[PDB]
Design a binder for this molecule. Structure first.
Ligand SMILES: *[C@@H]1O[C@H](CO)[C@@H](O)[C@H](O)[C@H]1NC(C)=O
Ligand SMILES: [Zn+2]
Length: 412
């Protein structure tokens, strides 16, 4: 039984300070007063360095020897571009990289850039640039030579699983190329030829008898905390769905972030059969989001471990851990606790496609399972009841990655 960590959306705020001025605690809160900020963070702020360091050492305490770590980006704070140049972005990425290397010196990391890991934010080019080159240098110890060249060109690559094993491969995507706010790829059908490349990779895996873990930052489909918010341009969404529908037999799981909230996405074929599942891991940052439509969109800091079969890559379980920031901010040393274990939370035998489909049906049909899922969705920050509209938003987001099916589900 192997284990691997998944962390995402650390969103370091370099300027977080416990200030008596509510408006000078953290630039990531904008003009929102931050009253009684604590040393481990604030729900209105991105992560202080203390919080990120705490998350890494909590991972080390819980499991110091993972098979590997998946890290899906977003290292910089939610601030105006003018406050955050390219040098600062690269320095922040390097500092988080070096922290992971120092806490887990000998552990392979599969790292994907998040939409904030660029200057200007979200403007990911479909070609090589200074940031891709420097980050390729930073992550070079985890990259094969082919992966190094590929990352320099488009920040995507495919790496063997650690050790001698030829079971399994991790495909690291740069899905920031598909975010609608990315003007660098507007008018591009297959930016960086990623989709084509991905198809080839998956084909090779089927030829070679490998299973694949696909990771990326920005997921296809919709954001469960509001209605009709998708990140991918529609054509990119459709292409990603086509890729999954063709190659689901070699994909043992998908792992993404960018929501900061805990949810999952099911993929179905045209017969209704469940064919794949994507796990949206929560963020370390607790930052209350400024996205229109979302109310009280903060979360507790979360980290996640997966238990998997090394021979087959079958996902056996996941365990999500969290820091109750309200409690941690009055304590000498913050202690992370198990938030939940998937199989226990949803009464399913594993984290496979069938099990995740069962979990979705339970969420959609049983009020206490829906409430359990909803509390975990904010990493146990928001304990209010998920009523009918909330239920529909979450069920439709989980069940429908396609635009048309999601909207029709929303009609309900
Ligand atoms: C990071 O956390 C570890 C473990 O709690 C602690 O020993 C160390 O002092 C922390 N480092 C910083 C810079 O806060
Ligand atoms: Zn993001």
């Amino acid at each position: 039984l192997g284990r691997f960590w998944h962390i995402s959306d650390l969103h370091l705020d370099p300027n977080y300070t416990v200030s008596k001025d509510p408006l000078q605690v953290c630039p990531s809160a904008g003009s929102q007063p931050v009253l009684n900020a604590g040393p481990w963070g604030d729900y209105l702020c991105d992560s202080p360095w203390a919080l990120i360091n705490s998350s890494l050492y909590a991972m080390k305490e819980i499991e110091p020897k993972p098979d590997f770590i998946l890290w899906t980006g977003d290292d910089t704070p939610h601030v105006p571009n003018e406050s955050l140049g390219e040098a600062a972005v690269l320095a922040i990425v390097e500092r988080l990289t070096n922290l992971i290397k120092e806490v887990f010196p000998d552990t392979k990391v599969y790292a994907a850039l998040g939409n904030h890991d660029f200057h200007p934010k979200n403007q990911f080019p479909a070609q090589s640039n200074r940031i891709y080159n420097q980050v390729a240098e930073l992550w070079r110890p985890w990259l094969s030579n082919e992966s190094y060249a590929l990352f320099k060109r488009g920040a995507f690559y495919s790496e063997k699983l650690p050790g001698p094993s030829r079971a399994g491969r991790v495909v690291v995507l740069n899905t920031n190329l598909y975010y609608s706010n990315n003007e660098q790829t507007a008018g591009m059908a297959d930016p960086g030829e990623q989709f084509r490349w991905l198809g080839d990779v998956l084909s090779n895996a089927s030829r070679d008898g490998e299973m694949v873990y696909v990771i990326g930052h920005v997921p296809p489909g919709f954001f469960e905390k509001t209605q009709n918010k998708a990140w991918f341009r529609e054509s990119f969404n459709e292409e990603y769905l086509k890729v999954i529908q063709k190659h689901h037999r070699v994909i043992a799981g998908q792992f993404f972030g960018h929501h900061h909230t805990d949810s999952f996405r099911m993929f179905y074929d045209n017969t209704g059969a469940p064919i794949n599942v994507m796990f949206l891991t929560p963020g370390v940052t607790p930052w209350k989001t400024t996205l229109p439509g979302v109310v009280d969109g903060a979360n507790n800091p979360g980290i996640r471990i997966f238990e998997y079969d090394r021979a087959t890559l079958n996902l056996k379980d996941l365990v999500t851990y969290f820091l109750n920031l309200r409690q941690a901010n009055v304590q000498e040393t913050p202690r992370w606790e198990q938030e939940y274990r998937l199989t226990e939370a949803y009464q399913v035998p594993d984290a496979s496609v069938s099990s995740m489909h069962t979990a979705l049906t339970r969420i959609a049909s049983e009020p206490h399972i829906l409430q359990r899922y909803y509390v975990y969705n904010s990493v146990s920050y928001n304990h209010l009841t998920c009523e009918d509209s909330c239920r529909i938003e979450h069920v439709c987001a989980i069940q429908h990655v396609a635009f048309n099916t999601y909207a029709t589900c929303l009609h309900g």
